[PDB]
Amino acid sequence: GPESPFEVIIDKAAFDKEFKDSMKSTYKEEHPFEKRRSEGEKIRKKYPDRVPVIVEKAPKARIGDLDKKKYLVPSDLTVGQFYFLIRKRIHLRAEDALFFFVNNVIPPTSATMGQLYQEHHEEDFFLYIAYSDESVYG
Amino acid sequence: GPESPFEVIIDKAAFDKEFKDSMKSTYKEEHPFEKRRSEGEKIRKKYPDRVPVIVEKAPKARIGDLDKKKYLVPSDLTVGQFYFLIRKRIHLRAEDALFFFVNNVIPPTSATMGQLYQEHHEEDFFLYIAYSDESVYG
Amino acid sequence: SPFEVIIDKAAFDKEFKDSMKSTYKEEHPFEKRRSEGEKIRKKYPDRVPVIVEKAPKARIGDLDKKKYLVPSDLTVGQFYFLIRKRIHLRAEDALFFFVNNVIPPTSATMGQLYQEHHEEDFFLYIAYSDESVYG
């Protein structure tokens, strides 16, 4: 039996702070916060049944880029279904790898986009998803 | 200038319609809809604990075929545990990939078979699970 | 027999619940682990003790450290991300976690995983591999 020490791991709040901006977003860098928040707030009021989503390629990803970054997604569509739709947009074959990341974690396919947004949207009222052929963002 | 347009993505009902015919079943093609509705009802009324599931190889799949298509499964068992067992029955190698699909999406390992049935059963009271070496059905 | 009827929890757990190898279990006797598990849970009720070890067949680095004291509100996905960094895996490397031979969903909290699956020594055991099934 070990009196050897435990590795004392951080909790959710410390994780969230440690990795807050660890996923890059050219969208966040090219548009000032107040303008994003304004547009995000307005689109949620105009279409309450949909959520605004920014989808961008991870820097290390070896995979085609997306023609469009800004997605307005019905809240009852699951993550798995949105993934299937984005796969078609990249023109990936079914055997090809594709992974989604929200705050450095792959969300389960059964989550609705409405739940994902409600749980993880940023203060500008957008949800940020990065994608990669790798099973980790970085 | 004006705000960049969003890509307006389809919702769940439109997803379900656009990809309903995506998944083919030899068991559904060799067994009429009325016979399967009666059979699925009879087992489902006789066996409320267990759920009836058809497990079949995706057409483009490169996996070994199963000896048995029809399964009556204790609905408390999780899909992950069912998956473990089905892997055992294919005598699949640990280095080989295997995925389950319902309506072109992989179900979560923590779901009981009852939740998957009551959420995705067809009009014949049958749950349809496809398996493949591919991370997507098509 | 047209329908195939599959075996249940009693045989499942009797057959598999101790089936993943643990060098920790082999090197520390059950009585001392149970004592340490009980004590650490009463001392830090907001955390859960976790042993993380390589599956026998895995082609993957070993961990410098096995014993983790994990806040119960951290999700499995978050803990996975942290363990990946400790193994110093490259982004292109695959990594899978197994609890009782099943991959847990990333959204489960470590507190729930522990509650559902800890053993009688009051530790939760996770095995990892580059393969998508324990081996």
Numbering used by the authors:
A (entry chain A), B (entry chain C): 1 to 138
C (entry chain B): 4 to 138
According to the publication:
Landmark proteins called autophagy receptors bind specific targets and interact with Atg8-family proteins on the isolation membrane through the Atg8-family-interacting motif (AIM) (also called the LC3-interacting region, LIR). The core of the AIM is composed of four amino-acid residues [W/F/Y]-X-X-[L/I/V]28. The first aromatic residue and the fourth aliphatic residue bind to two hydrophobic pockets in Atg8 (the W- and L-sites, respectively), and the main chain of the motif forms an intermolecular parallel β-sheet with a β-strand (β2) of Atg828. Nonetheless, deletion of the short helix from RTN3245–264 reduced the interactions with mAtg8s. Thus, the C-terminal helix-assisted AIM/LIR is a unique structural basis commonly seen in the interactions of yeast Atg40 and these mammalian ER-phagy receptors with Atg8-family proteins.
